[PDB]
Amino acid sequence: EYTVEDVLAVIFLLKEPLGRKQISERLELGEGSVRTLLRKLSHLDIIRSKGHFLTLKGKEIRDKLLSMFSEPIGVSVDGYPGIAIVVKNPPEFKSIELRDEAIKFDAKGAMILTVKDNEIVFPEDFRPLKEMYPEVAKKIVDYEDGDAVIITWAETPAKALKSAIHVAYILKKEEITPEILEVV
């Protein structure tokens, strides 16, 4: 009823204390699913209530996530809501494969870029992103040479968020803490 991507999303979202209905809207998850997810997080001492906030364990987990990812940021691509996530020291990847996985997770589209000479570039020809999407590129921060930059877009912000996290998870699967995997 919930996925590792939902667990990761909640931890990203809880940078600020949030109520259960706000979480439901931003994840686009059922009430039963959100309730169960938040209860598991509570049992595991990852969150506490009275909105929900991260415990010391939950904060250590989030800090660890932010060591391998940037804060997800809202963008707009061709008029659709999108999300950009920087993946720090990524393995090598095939952008087209990751795009296809993002669309399977309900993205309308995706770009997976790299960073060269401190600019976000397309991986084949190394042309800058900002030539095609200047407003998107300008919003993306917290990257360095060699990092990957996931950009998804979708019909809703929740679908953009979920699909971007799915791509992030593929790239960093082996590095995701067992404490997070324990939630599923």
Automatic annotation (TrEMBL):
It comes from the Archaea. Transmembrane segments: none annotated. Residues 83-169 form the DUF4443 domain. One of its GO terms (biological process) is translation. GO terms for cellular component: cytoplasm. Signal peptide: none annotated. InterPro entries: DUF4443 (IPR029349), GAD-like_sf (IPR004115), PH0730-like_N (IPR054039), WH-like_DNA-bd_sf (IPR036388), WH_DNA-bd_sf (IPR036390). Gene3D superfamilies: GAD-like domain, Winged helix-like DNA-binding domain superfamily/Winged helix DNA-binding domain. Keywords: ATP-binding, Ligase, Nucleotide-binding, Protein biosynthesis. One of its GO terms (molecular function) is aminoacyl-tRNA ligase activity. Residues 3-60 form the PH0730-like N-terminal domain. The keyword Metal-binding does not apply. This is Uncharacterized protein. It comes from Pyrococcus horikoshii (strain ATCC 700860 / DSM 12428 / JCM 9974 / NBRC 100139 / OT-3). The lineage of its organism: Archaea, Methanobacteriati, Methanobacteriota, Thermococci, Thermococcales.
